[PDB]
Sequence to fold (1421 residues):
Amino acid sequence: FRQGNLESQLKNRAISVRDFVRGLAKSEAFKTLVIKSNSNYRLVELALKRLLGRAPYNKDEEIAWSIKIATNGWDGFVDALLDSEEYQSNFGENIVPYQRRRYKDRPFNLVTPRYGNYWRDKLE
Amino acid sequence: VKTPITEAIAAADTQGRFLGNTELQSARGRYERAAASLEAARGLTSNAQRLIDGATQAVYQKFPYTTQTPGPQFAADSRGKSKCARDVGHYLRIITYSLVAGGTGPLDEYLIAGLAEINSTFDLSPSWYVEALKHIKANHGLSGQAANEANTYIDYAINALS
Amino acid sequence: VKTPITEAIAAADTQGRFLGNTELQSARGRYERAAASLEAARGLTSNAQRLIDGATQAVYQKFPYTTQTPGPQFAADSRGKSKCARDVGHYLRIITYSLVAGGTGPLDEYLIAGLAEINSTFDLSPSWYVEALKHIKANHGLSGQAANEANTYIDYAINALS
Amino acid sequence: ITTAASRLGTEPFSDAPKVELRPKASREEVESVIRAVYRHVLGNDYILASERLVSAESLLRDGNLTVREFVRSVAKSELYKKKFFYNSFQTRLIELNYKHLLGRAPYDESEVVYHLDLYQNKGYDAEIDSYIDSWEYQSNFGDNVVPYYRGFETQVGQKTAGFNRIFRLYRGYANSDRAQVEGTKSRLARELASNKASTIVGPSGTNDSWGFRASADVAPKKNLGNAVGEGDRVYRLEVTGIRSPGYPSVRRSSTVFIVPYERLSDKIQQVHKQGGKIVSVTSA
Amino acid sequence: MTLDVFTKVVSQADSRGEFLSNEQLDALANVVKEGNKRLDVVNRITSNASAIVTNAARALFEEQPQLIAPGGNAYTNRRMAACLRDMEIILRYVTYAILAGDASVLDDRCLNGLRETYQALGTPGSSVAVGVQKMKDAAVGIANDPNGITKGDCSQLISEVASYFDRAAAAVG
Amino acid sequence: TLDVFTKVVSQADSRGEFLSNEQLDALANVVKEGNKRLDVVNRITSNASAIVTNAARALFEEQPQLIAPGGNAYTNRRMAACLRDMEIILRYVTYAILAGDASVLDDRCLNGLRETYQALGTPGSSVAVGVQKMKDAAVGIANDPNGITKGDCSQLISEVASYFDRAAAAVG
Amino acid sequence: TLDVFTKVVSQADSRGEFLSNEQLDALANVVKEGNKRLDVVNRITSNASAIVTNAARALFEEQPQLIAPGGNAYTNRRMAACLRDMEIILRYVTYAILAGDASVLDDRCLNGLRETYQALGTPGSSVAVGVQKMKDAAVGIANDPNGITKGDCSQLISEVASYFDRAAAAVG
Amino acid sequence: TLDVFTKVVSQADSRGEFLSNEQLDALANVVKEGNKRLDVVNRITSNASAIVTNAARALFEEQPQLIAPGGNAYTNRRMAACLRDMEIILRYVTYAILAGDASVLDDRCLNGLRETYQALGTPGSSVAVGVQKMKDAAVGIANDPNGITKGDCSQLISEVASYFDRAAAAVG
Ligand SMILES: *[C@H](C)[C@H]1/C(=C/c2[nH]c(/C=C3N=C(/C=C4\NC(=O)C(CC)=C4C)C(C)=C\3CCC(=O)O)c(CCC(=O)O)c2C)NC(=O)[C@@H]1C
Ligand SMILES: *[C@H](C)[C@H]1/C(=C/c2[nH]c(/C=C3N=C(/C=C4\NC(=O)C(CC)=C4C)C(C)=C\3CCC(=O)O)c(CCC(=O)O)c2C)NC(=O)[C@@H]1C
Ligand SMILES: *[C@H](C)[C@H]1/C(=C/c2[nH]c(/C=C3N=C(/C=C4\NC(=O)C(CC)=C4C)C(C)=C\3CCC(=O)O)c(CCC(=O)O)c2C)NC(=O)[C@@H]1C
Ligand SMILES: CCC1=C(C)/C(=C/C2=NC(=C\c3[nH]c(/C=C4\NC(=O)[C@H](C)[C@H]4CC)c(C)c3CCC(=O)O)/C(CCC(=O)O)=C2C)NC1=O
Ligand SMILES: CCC1=C(C)/C(=C/C2=NC(=C\c3[nH]c(/C=C4\NC(=O)[C@H](C)[C@H]4CC)c(C)c3CCC(=O)O)/C(CCC(=O)O)=C2C)NC1=O
Ligand SMILES: CCC1=C(C)/C(=C/C2=NC(=C\c3[nH]c(/C=C4\NC(=O)[C@H](C)[C@H]4CC)c(C)c3CCC(=O)O)/C(CCC(=O)O)=C2C)NC1=O
Ligand SMILES: CCC1=C(C)/C(=C/C2=NC(=C\c3[nH]c(/C=C4\NC(=O)[C@H](C)[C@H]4CC)c(C)c3CCC(=O)O)/C(CCC(=O)O)=C2C)NC1=O
Ligand SMILES: CCC1=C(C)/C(=C/C2=NC(=C\c3[nH]c(/C=C4\NC(=O)[C@H](C)[C@H]4CC)c(C)c3CCC(=O)O)/C(CCC(=O)O)=C2C)NC1=O
Ligand SMILES: CCC1=C(C)/C(=C/C2=NC(=C\c3[nH]c(/C=C4\NC(=O)[C@H](C)[C@H]4CC)c(C)c3CCC(=O)O)/C(CCC(=O)O)=C2C)NC1=O
Ligand SMILES: CCC1=C(C)/C(=C/C2=NC(=C\c3[nH]c(/C=C4\NC(=O)[C@H](C)[C@H]4CC)c(C)c3CCC(=O)O)/C(CCC(=O)O)=C2C)NC1=O
Ligand SMILES: CCC1=C(C)/C(=C/C2=NC(=C\c3[nH]c(/C=C4\NC(=O)[C@H](C)[C@H]4CC)c(C)c3CCC(=O)O)/C(CCC(=O)O)=C2C)NC1=O
Fold:
């Protein structure tokens, strides 16, 4: 799954780490693993949970980000998330994604499965 | 810096749109307010030597140990008292700055940013300047609505100290 | 650029001294010269369409081969004659520039620097524009002291062509 | 150079008359030649009256002395060493003597190598003799003509990498060259052997941000990555001074960004929000 | 950085470290009196914002026809739109500076890299200056004429607007 | 080095058209106010050295720490550096008054003064106070009528107060 | 300043071994094509000034805004900067053709051209177009046989088209 | 981030041979002086905040213009920038003392400090003086024996005086 070209760029330093995460989110090796198996509202939640490193606030905001993804594509919704003012101020320009505050909160990798409860029912 | 003119500007910049009537009404709220605030600044600049003499002597009578205790931080020596009138002489500039600018910009950029950061290091108790400003709050001699506008900035500095 | 005001400035700069009476007298020589030179510029700007029509037709009758010989450099095609009125239309601007500036600054900076450099490459004979300016020298229509002032810059351009 | 000379501050050098020394003696022209020597050689530092070298001057009045022998004698004088030679590195000086005695910034590093083995074997007083007795000095400066800056025009045979090392040398007419914030260290000793040519930064007010030096470990100028952007146009924008949110957010001001095309328009809007100023974007 | 006329005096008086002098407060009291004329001029531009973008565009693309001609820098419909969209961005940052009364907001956003960004882009700087100079004689002319309003001479205030476009023009071309 | 005239020339060169009539009407007014421009420039250089020393004493009183030891202008040499320099503001200001344009002021005396001080350690305030103490005395020297014919030059003196304010605000 | 020969020398110096046999076999081929290299280099400098003016007219037609006022190559002084500097590409290209290596082209005419334009305001794209108009005419001048013996120069002319493409793509 | 051990490791990796006997004899001495290294590092971080304030007062007395308006450290916000920073020298110095190598000091606190100031306007001398006022007090804190066993560490304390002198001379 790992990309050779992207890894080389970081060492060179040509691409900012924030520009580097765009490679992994718009990677079709990543896209087959998560977009075939997950619905649109789960695609909001997984992108907030990993890239922004935050839990979603409510249900009504995964609905809010949903319209943009269908029209702008998966790349266009990721592009709007990474160029959000909230992402650029708090992570800053060159700092790897992480969870901001977890005083007593589940790790998100453990908390959220790569795929959804819907796609499991097709497998049965 | 923060000014309710530039507060209207920087808000319209992030949306990427022209100055509508939303940002425009924030301007004349600053404009009219200056006529009750500029002679609020004239009441302080004319009484400059009174208040820094008054607040410095008010600190010593409130805290009598600060003239006796040996230390650089205190006002036992002469250069402490020379640094005494420098500090409260520096407070009255920014209050006259933030009254003339009409916002809490110069109070943010020049006084209270890192003000709680330095006082932990040099063990300057902030309650010293609380009683210093409270003497200026009662003895600035200003009257009317203009005085009230001027006063908020004294109380805005006190809440930043605490 | 060169102006007898700035000629007085740049001379006093290298010596590192103030504007004495040596540099000061160079200013009023420029000032009262302008009153015989500004209406010398008004005589050319009012007659703008006359002279560029007159000098272009004067070139063709002086050199009859330049309308017939096939080449980009010549005026056989239409875009040659379109570039004809552009060139002499560009000369009359700088003469009105250098009359208004009162010095040979704009003639130096905008026309004659590298003028003998390009004409070797594009095989534009300078004797073409010599006869072009000599028609303007005789048909400008300017008279009196002002005319004399407009007459030198025409002759200063001719000696730069040759 | 005109309308770039206003910005870079090189309009006074662009139309600067040669002083010369016509062989008839006159005190005023000699007085104005002497200011033209000490302004260029000492980098617009001031000379006080004990600093005047009045005994240097007596020889100058006589016919035998030639501005060329005078310029040898000001640089060998201990006054000139007190400002430049003692408070500086030896490579900086080899770089510096080309700025004063020759007028151009050093072209190759190999020119520099020759000087060190000359400086060791024959001393510094014979090094300055080798700057003056050069064919490039005699070709453009006569015996009676002051050295001026030749960095700007073509001076055929120059490399253009040396066109931009001259703008790293002096920051305007107004500057001392002891008064640049890297004053003691050689600004071009890294550039001469990396053999890259850094970005021209102009002086203050005409350019809104003068505060850009090339870093140690900075982003490469030409890059390979597509950088997420759908169309390959990639541009390399550097910022000069960033005073945006503190201790973890900005660990390093003046960092060079490499941003592709389609997010360049939002990128300039983020940098200005940070309060930073842009000295250069460059296609690569 | 975003500065006012007021914070211009503040940051200048901060560097000397003295109190605000009396004539500076006398000068700023005059800015209060001309404050209502400043809202007269700024409101008139943004009402005629889109009308002056299209009108200055036609006068530009007539008098330089090679731009929308093929091979030109503004030929295709995309670049064209960007150029068209941009001409608001001069006016966005000019009318910020008129309402601010200072050229600090104009300098670090719309002036700090425009003469920078064009060498890598191939856009012509001189042409752009002309485009902005075609805005200036129409933006002054829109705010000049009086219809259904009190008549006063701010000529000392309109010259600030003509200075702001001339600051925006000469920094690029 | 630009004039008021070559300001109009280089501006009319960029548009590539002839000089318009009102521009020649405006420049004809500069001819009429040309003799008042020599009135103001001659009055400064006659009082040049008197206004350097007088602005120096008012500076070094009101900031006493400069000539005090440890200060930036303490020793005799640097002190002459500052003293010699205060003419160089006035050298390039009265160039700009006689030019009528701020182009000569900008690329010589303004282009690197705020640059050169970070490497030098000279404080910003000292320069600003020093030039702003020249301005109220240079305007006051050219204001008073004694043995000259009375005229009006308030539209011209404001150019001089703008030139010092251009020189002051570009540094501090 | 490197050759094809000193390219192999400095490469064989880094490994520190003797020169291998096939490297001498390859350099013996450069001796055989050495007379064709003087055929191509002599043909360019004979047509040097004719190809500067001819590529200039095709540039300044197809971008008319340059000569036009406000353009970067408007006035007669800058215009000579551009017109005569088109030789300097050709000066350093025909050095590299006779050298057979792009080292002389890189550190003189390529090392700071994309550098020097941001400070100058000369458009990068315009310069690239001009050199690419030289390339199709410089190849076409050396291609045609008139009064020379017929040979094959396809593998050598492609080096010349590579040299202009190296000079073009490093700027624009 | 390198040690004294990984200094020898990465040096022995480049030659590609086994670790020699005297290198293991030298590193065995670093084990014996290892407990004195924890004596010196623990004494600085216990007196960390006391030596920041004490070196700050001696700096801002002897350069009073920083404190004075117009200075680079005038306002309370910048003042905390400088004050907060003086720990960051000490944060990366005591890293290098416990590491025994100057590699961690070089690529974090030394690699861009002389870089970042030209864009910032912070003077070089102020930074250099402050670091050098830390050094004579940091050595003096670790020198005196009070309630510790007496030993000899002059060959180890000179490493600490070298680390501040490395930090000082790379900026000013
Ligand atoms: C249409 C016949 C009826 C209708 C449509 C309508 N919907 C909305 C708001 C939303 N629609 C969606 C739909 C989708 N999101 C998806 O990701 C996909 C699959 C790719 C679909 C079909 C969502 C998420 C919303 C929420 C907001 C959004 O646009 O992003 C509106 C707007 C309503 C509002 O803004 O409150 C409308 C008009 N509604 C009707 O009236 C018709 C009966
Ligand atoms: C202190 C003796 C002098 C001084 C310092 C000063 N620094 C700043 C601001 C910054 N300092 C740094 C330093 C670093 N960041 C790093 O990552 C490293 C490597 C470990 C260092 C050394 C940075 C990045 C900044 C940015 C601003 C910030 O605080 O976030 C200031 C403030 C400048 C301003 O404009 O606010 C100051 C004053 N100044 C003096 O006068 C002292 C002599
Ligand atoms: C129009 C008068 C002139 C012109 C313009 C032109 N611009 C572009 C491309 C861009 N312009 C910008 C400009 C800005 N970004 C900012 O943040 C600000 C300050 C608010 C400004 C003014 C940017 C970012 C781009 C590129 C990407 C993008 O716009 O999103 C082009 C495109 C050229 C091309 O080949 O792509 C053109 C043509 N063109 C002219 O000829 C006029 C003189
Ligand atoms: C512009 C806004 C502004 C203010 C007000 C300010 C205050 C300030 N006062 C300080 C010290 C001081 N402050 C005081 C003042 C006092 N101590 C006493 O004993 C009295 C109770 C009291 C006065 C009433 C003294 C005596 C010092 C020196 C203490 C020392 O050197 O340790 C210091 C640390 C050292 C310095 O640079 O001088 C700051 C930063 N700084 C700012 O930027
Ligand atoms: C701003 C001052 C200024 C002027 C005036 C100027 C003139 C000028 N005219 C030129 C060519 C030309 N000049 C002309 C003009 C003429 N040829 C004729 O046949 C007619 C007799 C005559 C006009 C009356 C023509 C037709 C060309 C094109 C010739 C060619 O392409 O070879 C050229 C070379 C190519 C160019 O860029 O277009 C210059 C530099 N340049 C300047 O910078
Ligand atoms: C006409 C264009 C022009 C300017 C403007 C100029 C300024 C100028 N001021 C300088 C120095 C200086 N400038 C000052 C000025 C001051 N220091 C203070 O603390 C005071 C507040 C202030 C005087 C009021 C001082 C003191 C120095 C000497 C610094 C030193 O010797 O360390 C230097 C460095 C060279 C030298 O000092 O010999 C230059 C170039 N030079 C020029 O050619
Ligand atoms: C054609 C040249 C010209 C202009 C520009 C002009 C403007 C102008 N605006 C005025 C008033 C005014 N203008 C405004 C405008 C506003 N206040 C706000 O807070 C709003 C945001 C904004 C409208 C969007 C207001 C509130 C007044 C108060 C006086 C009045 O009603 O006229 C007046 C009244 C007389 C005076 O001010 O001396 C003048 C002169 N008069 C002229 O002759
Ligand atoms: C205090 C404010 C003030 C100024 C500045 C002032 C100047 C002034 N200079 C004048 C005349 C003049 N001023 C000059 C000055 C000179 N001509 C040269 O060519 C020399 C280089 C230079 C002297 C060095 C001359 C020659 C005149 C002619 C008229 C006269 O003799 O007064 C006049 C006569 C009346 C008028 O011009 O309307 C005025 C008003 N009057 C004022 O009320
Ligand atoms: C869009 C097409 C285009 C090109 C290519 C162009 C080139 C051009 N290069 C110029 C100058 C220059 N050209 C160079 C370039 C060089 N000199 C050297 O020493 C090196 C050998 C060589 C680079 C490899 C330099 C250094 C200058 C400045 C020379 C001067 O100012 O006198 C000038 C005159 C001044 C100017 O505006 O900057 C033009 C017009 N103009 C154009 O419109
Ligand atoms: C430095 C002075 C000098 C020159 C100029 C020179 C050229 C030169 N070119 C030659 C051959 C040649 N030159 C060419 C060149 C070409 N044929 C084509 O059709 C292509 C378009 C073109 C290359 C692009 C060819 C094909 C030959 C055939 C003979 C050979 O391979 O050398 C030869 C072989 C010997 C001879 O002709 O007598 C000479 C002398 N020799 C010299 O001493
Ligand atoms: C003033 C110059 C000076 C220094 C610096 C000094 C230090 C010093 N620390 C020692 C011991 C020691 N020092 C430590 C310190 C520590 N071990 C840990 O694991 C902890 C993390 C850390 C404390 C936080 C320990 C554990 C010993 C063991 C021996 C003893 O108790 O003294 C000894 C015992 C004698 C010897 O080592 O030869 C010396 C000399 N003696 C001197 O004369």
The radius of gyration of chain D is 22 Å. The interface with chain G takes residues 1-4, 7-8, 159-161, 163-164, 167, 195-200, 202, 280, 282-283 of chain D (CB under 8 Å). Residues 5 and 11 of chain D are 5 Å apart (CA to CA). The longest helix of chain D spans residues 27-41.
